[PDB]
Design a protein around this ligand. Structure first.
Ligand SMILES: *[C@@H]1O[C@H](CO[C@@H]2O[C@@H](C)[C@@H](O)[C@@H](O)[C@@H]2O)[C@@H](O[C@@H]2O[C@H](CO)[C@@H](O)[C@H](O)[C@H]2NC(C)=O)[C@H](O)[C@H]1NC(C)=O
Ligand SMILES: *[C@@H]1O[C@H](CO[C@@H]2O[C@@H](C)[C@@H](O)[C@@H](O)[C@@H]2O)[C@@H](O[C@@H]2O[C@H](CO)[C@@H](O)[C@H](O)[C@H]2NC(C)=O)[C@H](O)[C@H]1NC(C)=O
Ligand SMILES: *[C@@H]1O[C@H](CO[C@@H]2O[C@@H](C)[C@@H](O)[C@@H](O)[C@@H]2O)[C@@H](O[C@@H]2O[C@H](CO)[C@@H](O)[C@H](O)[C@H]2NC(C)=O)[C@H](O)[C@H]1NC(C)=O
Ligand SMILES: *[C@@H]1O[C@H](CO[C@@H]2O[C@@H](C)[C@@H](O)[C@@H](O)[C@@H]2O)[C@@H](O)[C@H](O)[C@H]1NC(C)=O
Ligand SMILES: C[N+](C)(C)CCSSc1ccc([N+](=O)[O-])c(C(=O)O)c1
Ligand SMILES: C[N+](C)(C)CCSSc1ccc([N+](=O)[O-])c(C(=O)O)c1
Ligand SMILES: *[C@@H]1O[C@H](CO)[C@@H](O)[C@H](O)[C@H]1NC(C)=O
Ligand SMILES: *[C@@H]1O[C@H](CO)[C@@H](O)[C@H](O)[C@H]1NC(C)=O
Ligand code: NA
Length: 527
């Protein structure tokens, strides 16, 4: 039995055997008052002390959210769906610490993705016990509100100010600052890491002054705030809030009575209307996400980035080779996870209309022009891969590169990676390649489990990534120094060196997606 006294009371954990050693897991520690009743849509309130022993013995409830039901029974989609009960009572976090209790361990704080609409800390690919066992770090992960319950926004209105999910995260980071030393963690050695919307959340904490003092360093996998899906303007956020009130029959003149009415609706009626606050949506629709609230975000974030107004520290940023393929089977015509999805020129044009609905004909033609100059017009998969790269380059790769250029320009060390290994256990078909979200299991060291049917070369790769992530956390330098590994150079805006991650050859390259990103970053914003 192992019990830790926290500032709010005692918590009991559990012992796990990992690789012939022991990890202590505290699953489901509350870090806030449950945001129920009159607390729905408001910022999280600070937890009141308890005097019992909280049994942190099971993952807690996941936050309310819609579920991907497009491929029932298919592990490739269902592995991302919540694996605990849905509840508005969901503000809880998990702690994995090595056994024996370390003395001053670097802490790694995971923020999950899911488009700000979905996600939960309890997923199998976010299990921090391997990192705790192997690198002797402490891993913290938290649930935070998503969807309209997490990001409904009426400007300057404390009944629904926006960004509550980001404030959920920030109160967890605070909890770590006040409590993790009881668990043997170093509150001065805290690294945030996240993927997708989680990565965008990490980039926004670097911009939020209230988060400056709650962490040391940041890791951003496949995501950043300047991605086109990541931040909503105060305009549309208020328009979407009011469209939701119409749909639920909550339209009122006094905007506070609107929220009060919305607080008496059942979570399911809110959830089943989120998708319609927008006239035309896409597979990448983020109907309720971060806004410039004037609180978490004190100005438009593109301006803060550009003028150097952010936490000065090291970053580790990266993307996957086929970021965009996952979304093609969620609407684009001619695509299937069950066939090779060879599409025609006409199908590719219709695909752009799905993914760029509110764009001019000239804007959509400009995409087609830049992506259909073929090395061989007789290759039958030209259009299939073009649309994948279009969605990937626009939504993930080019924003990530541009974040890294702009952040490094202010003097901080930056490190960029290009993950190009396709999991040998990946359930999706091969044309989808190195998919969005499928470096996570390597970062968390699941292929270090010999029982789980990865290849030996996948064990070696995960091992080396895990050491690089941990050295970055502890020391700000993502090297693997013992096993002749390729040195990871810093990313400067001049030379733009990045490192490729794969089972074969780890390589230094320059200027990833150079031509593609000059289009997305310096032409397409004008259309
Ligand atoms: C635990 O370690 C810290 C120092 O952590 C290191 O320094 C940080 C700035 C950051 O770079 C981390 O990744 C490093 O691991 C000790 O902090 C010292 O504490 C005293 C009192 O607060 C202060 O006067 C010193 O300046 C701190 N040292 C610093 C800031 O470098 C802390 O005491 C250690 N605690 C235990 C129990 O081992
Ligand atoms: C701002 O909101 C309006 C209202 O949206 C409509 O009602 C909502 C409840 C929801 O069902 C939306 O999809 C509906 O379209 C947006 O939509 C326009 O609304 C007006 C008035 O109802 C109507 O004339 C148009 O058909 C709607 N469609 C379009 C394409 O304008 C309006 O577009 C929103 N603003 C922006 C910039 O998107
Ligand atoms: C790949 O499959 C898509 C999707 O069709 C579904 O999955 C198939 C594998 C099969 O089981 C179909 O019955 C399913 O509907 C195909 O796109 C469809 O093509 C048909 C052809 O008659 C067309 O009528 C539908 O509108 C298409 N559905 C869309 C566009 O969403 C596609 O043709 C298949 N391609 C290849 C190369 O096999
Ligand atoms: C909290 O935990 C106490 C200790 O019991 C522990 O949990 C049970 C399920 C067994 O695994 C036992 O061996 C453990 O020591 C409980 O006595 C107490 O009732 C628990 N509180 C709850 C479940 O609300
Ligand atoms: C379509 N599918 C059910 C796979 C989305 C999962 S929930 S919606 C959503 C929208 C946009 C993003 N994104 O990254 O841009 C994400 C993400 O993967 O984080 C999620
Ligand atoms: C309706 N009306 C035009 C009054 C909206 C303003 S209300 S929300 C908001 C959003 C962004 C910021 N900011 O940081 O610039 C601030 C601030 O600090 O005043 C406030
Ligand atoms: C809206 O109603 C609330 C309900 O208590 C009230 O306090 C507030 O003054 C009203 N605001 C406006 C702008 O009418
Ligand atoms: C380094 O190589 C050894 C064998 O000499 C291997 O067992 C170990 O996993 C490697 N460590 C890292 C961090 O790659
Ligand atoms: Na390797």
């Amino acid at each position: 039995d192992i019990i830790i006294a926290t500032k709010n009371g005692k918590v009991r954990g559990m012992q796990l055997t990992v690789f012939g050693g022991t990890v202590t897991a505290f699953l489901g520690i509350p870090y806030a008052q449950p945001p129920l009743g009159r607390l729905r849509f408001k910022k999280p309130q600070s937890l009141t002390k308890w005097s019992d022993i909280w049994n942190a013995t099971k993952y807690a409830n996941s936050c309310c959210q819609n579920i991907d039901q497009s491929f029932p029974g298919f592990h490739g989609s269902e592995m991302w769906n919540p694996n605990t009960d849905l509840s508005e009572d969901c503000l809880y976090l998990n702690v994995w610490i090595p056994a024996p209790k370390p003395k001053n361990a670097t802490v790694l704080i995971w923020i999950y993705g899911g488009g700000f609409q979905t996600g939960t800390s309890s997923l199998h690919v976010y299990d921090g016990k391997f990192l705790a066992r192997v690198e002797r770090v402490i891993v913290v992960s938290m649930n935070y509100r998503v969807g309209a319950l997490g990001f409904l926004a009426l400007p300057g209105n404390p009944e629904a100010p926006g960004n509550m999910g980001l404030f959920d995260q920030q109160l967890a980071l605070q909890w770590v600052q006040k409590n993790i030393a009881a668990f043997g963690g170093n509150p001065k050695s805290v690294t945030l890491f996240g993927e997708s919307a989680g990565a965008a959340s990490v980039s926004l904490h670097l911009l939020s002054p209230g988060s400056h003092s709650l962490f040391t360093r940041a890791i951003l996998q496949s995501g950043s705030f300047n991605a086109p899906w990541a931040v909503t303007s105060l305009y549309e956020a208020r328009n979407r809030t009011l469209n939701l009130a119409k749909l639920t029959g909550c339209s009122r003149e006094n905007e506070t009575e609107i929220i009060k009415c919305l607080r008496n609706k059942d979570p399911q009626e809110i959830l089943l209307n989120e998708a319609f606050v927008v006239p035309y949506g896409t597979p990448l629709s983020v109907n309720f996400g971060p806004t410039v609230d004037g609180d978490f975000l004190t100005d438009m974030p593109d301006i803060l980035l550009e003028l150097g107004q952010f936490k000065k520290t090291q970053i580790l940023v990266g993307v996957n080779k086929d970021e965009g393929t996952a979304f093609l089977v969620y609407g684009a015509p001619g695509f299937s996870k069950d066939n090779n999805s060879i599409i025609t020129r006409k199908e590719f044009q219709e695909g752009l209309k799905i993914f760029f609905p509110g764009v001019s004909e000239f804007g959509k033609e400009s995409i087609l022009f830049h992506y259909t100059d073929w090395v061989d017009d007789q290759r039958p998969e030209n259009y299939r891969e073009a649309l994948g790269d279009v969605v990937g380059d626009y939504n993930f790769i080019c924003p990530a590169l541009e974040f890294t250029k702009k952040f490094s320009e202010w003097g901080n060390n930056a490190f960029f990676y290009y993950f190009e290994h396709r999991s040998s256990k990946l359930p999706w078909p091969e044309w989808m390649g190195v998919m969005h979200g499928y470096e996570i299991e390597f970062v968390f060291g699941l292929p270090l489990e010999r029982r789980d049917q990865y290849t030996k070369a996948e064990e070696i790769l995960s091992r080396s990534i895990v050491k690089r992530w941990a050295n970055f956390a502890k020391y700000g330098n993502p090297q693997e120094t013992q096993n002749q590994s390729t040195s990871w150079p810093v990313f400067k805006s001049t030379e733009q060196k990045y490192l490729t991650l794969n089972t074969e050859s780890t390589r230094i390259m320059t200027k990833l997606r150079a031509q593609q990103c000059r289009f997305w970053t310096s032409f397409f914003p004008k259309v």
